Design a protein around this ligand. Structure first.
Ligand SMILES: O=C(COC(F)F)N1C[C@H]2CCC[C@H]2C1
Ligand SMILES: O=C(COC(F)F)N1C[C@H]2CCC[C@H]2C1
Lengths: 263, 265
């Protein structure tokens, strides 16, 4: 696509593909999640990026800490969806990347997303606050006045997610990543976690309901040779509490919540 | 994309995406396989197939993949535009063939090509059957009459008989299950998932040092949503050759067999 007239956001139109849709012939939440990360990459490339000059000298990367997605209408197979994305500072806590999905024909908002990214060393995996010299390097590509995709004060994207208590109501055990699940850098794609979380949602809910909200908290990366267990409990529209953990020791890697509506 | 001037083939340009590339920052063979099935679906839709005829719908009949052969000379890089041209052709009452040609949008050179053999089957009973004349006439008007082969060679590798892998296998990837992302719109496992499962038993060292040049896959059975697969591999060979076997974890029922050919980077 291209940067908007002010250079402070990026837009891209995607045509939804045959293998990108589910049983309802509309894009899956993982296809939407894939399209959000693609428009985010093109926005970074269009302004010279995904690290700054300081970041590569210090072996620093932006890592996902939290992802929140709300979908009102899933684009059908053959439909064009327009996604607009931008970044914003959260001082020294990290960066936020926001998205707005629109119907290319009507112009209506059909979905929206927000993500929280934190600075981390590539080698030790130790968290880090954003330095001023780093902030100066990317502020010129962000709106100065706040531009929020989810502007509601105390909303679903900032809610504290509790840890799921054993025994879980549902579970999908023995989940492993394949080469298609890794990115260009050999790490498991952040979208795979969405898929693994939804694997423990019972098929009856998937057949009768539509996923409206998904909030995911990223605690630890699943390695190529790791095995995950996906756990789910109904906390309620249908509401679920989720937990991804290592098959062996039970080390937590993700926690989240989903909200579904009757079709 | 669109049908060509004669309406006997379809072309589409795809821009390669960030999540669609592997370690070498070029499209994976599963991304290529996904793009081939996407250009095939748009070709069917552009001539009124949204993918059976009136006779096929009335008789609960569908086209199923029996064999897929893909040969790649250059994998498109992240950001590159790849142009795929696809067409179909009759093989009398045996079935249909769908062929593909991948081209570099900048140079116009052929960077890859594929051929597939499809057979008619009843959706419910899963029993194969020959292409009837009533069906043949309904789709012949969308195929070239003179043969148009992507792999025309006198002794091409797309028609070679694949043997069954003998136990013990040299390599293996056990306990492979499909997730919802592996199913298509009809809830059946996507034919591309089998390519990935086959490659899961190729050792990582081969993937890091070699590039996949040829892959031939034979489809014997479909893996159900609640099935578990075992991927087996044995080296049969500057170039590396492998013999593959996908089978059910339990009884050892065969679902796929294939071969791969790799070349040093
Ligand atoms: O990768 C980041 C920061 O994390 C998150 F926001 F994507 N970026 C990408 C660069 C291009 C857009 C502004 C710059 C911030
Ligand atoms: O899908 C097929 C044939 O099955 C298989 F070979 F792909 N089709 C759909 C139409 C495309 C032009 C020929 C028509 C027959």
């Amino acid at each position: 696509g291209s940067l908007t007239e002010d250079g402070l956001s990026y837009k891209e139109k995607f045509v939804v593909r045959s293998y990108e849709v589910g049983s309802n012939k509309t894009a899956t939440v993982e296809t939407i999640a894939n399209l959000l990360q693609e428009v985010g990459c093109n926005h970074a490339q269009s302004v010279g990026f995904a690290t700054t000059t300081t970041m590569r000298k210090l072996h620093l990367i932006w890592v996902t800490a939290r992802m929140h997605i709300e979908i009102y209408k899933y684009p059908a197979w053959g439909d064009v969806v327009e996604i607009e994305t931008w970044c914003q500072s959260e001082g020294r806590i990290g960066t936020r990347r926001d998205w707005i999905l629109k119907d290319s024909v009507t112009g209506e908002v059909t979905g929206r997303a927000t993500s929280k990214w934190v600075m981390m060393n590539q080698d030790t995996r130790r968290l880090q606050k954003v330095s001023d010299d780093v902030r100066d390097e990317y502020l010129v590509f962000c709106p100065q006045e706040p531009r929020l995709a989810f502007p509601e004060e105390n909303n679903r994207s900032l809610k504290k997610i509790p840890k799921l208590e054993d025994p879980a109501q549902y579970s999908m055990i023995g989940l492993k990543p394949r080469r298609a699940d890794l990115d260009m850098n050999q790490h498991v794609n952040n979208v795979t976690y969405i898929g693994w979380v939804l694997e423990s949602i019972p098929q009856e809910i998937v057949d009768t309901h539509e996923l409206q909200v998904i909030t995911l908290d990223y605690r630890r990366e699943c390695q190529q040779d790791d095995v995950v267990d996906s756990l789910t409990t109904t906390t309620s529209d249908s509401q679920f509490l989720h937990l991804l953990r290592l098959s062996g020791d039970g080390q937590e890697i993700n926690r989240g919540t989903t909200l579904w509506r009757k079709k």
